[PDB]
């Protein structure tokens with residue numbers, strides 16, 4: 001039995017998949033804690049590790065495996081189903097098994113993804129500050145045609161305070177916040193002017209080591225829905241630029257309330273890809 005996590009129909013990815021568009025030959029780099037490549041519900045094509053002592057195709061934390069399955073869990077008779085199940089998945093390990101990484105390692109992963117011709121970068125990670133080198137790297141990736149997506153952060157709200165993390169806060173990166181299965185904002189989801197769109201992030205079931213499936217909460221779970229949605233759009237409209245894909249995602253989002261809390265709202269990939 002394959003479970004369809006609620007987020008797949010919530011963003012209308014099932015509608016696009018049913019038309020025959022599944023992200024085939026779209027290269028998506030998951031910059032995270034690695035991916036358990038031996039998981040039966042994932043195919044990892046390649047990647048690189050910028051974390052000492054850990055190979056790209058293992059995951060001692062679980063976070064990267066979970067994020068990867070939201071993008072690209074295989075469409076078969078077991079496990080779960082990704083947003084873009086035919087995506088070429090690359091594991092770019094920039095976080096260690098404890099979930100942390102240096103700015104230099106993250107920059108190295110972004111550069112690797114740009115040089116190696118990735119179509120989409122997903123960064124389910126963030127910090128209170130970024131760095132000048134990180135901004136350079138994401139700006140160059142976006143200018144070279146990569147759709148760059150990141151988790152907005154899990155700092156919630158505090159009056160009028162902007163709680164968006166980096167790299168999500170950079171203008172060349174899509175900052176993604178989290179809703180739940182009722183399409184309500186999750187209380188942990190960061191807020192602020194740079195918030196761009198929302199996606200499912202509370203109660204997200206996905207692949208998890210070893211060879212299993214688990215539920216996690218976070219804007220880290222929301223980001224890969226948007227990365228996967230970008231891959232569906234590209235599979236249907238292969239000639240679009242990165243800015244055109246980005247504008248399709250935000251312009252066609254379902255409004256949920258104030259942009260401070262939701263950005264343009266919940267992505268709708270059926271509308272975005274039409």
Ligand SMILES: [Ca+2]
Pocket residue numbers: 004005006007205
């Ligand atoms: Ca579910």
Ligand SMILES: [Ca+2]
Pocket residue numbers: 002041073074075076077078079080081
């Ligand atoms: Ca599956």
Ligand code: NA
Pocket residue numbers: 167168169170171172173174175194196
């Ligand atoms: Na941004």
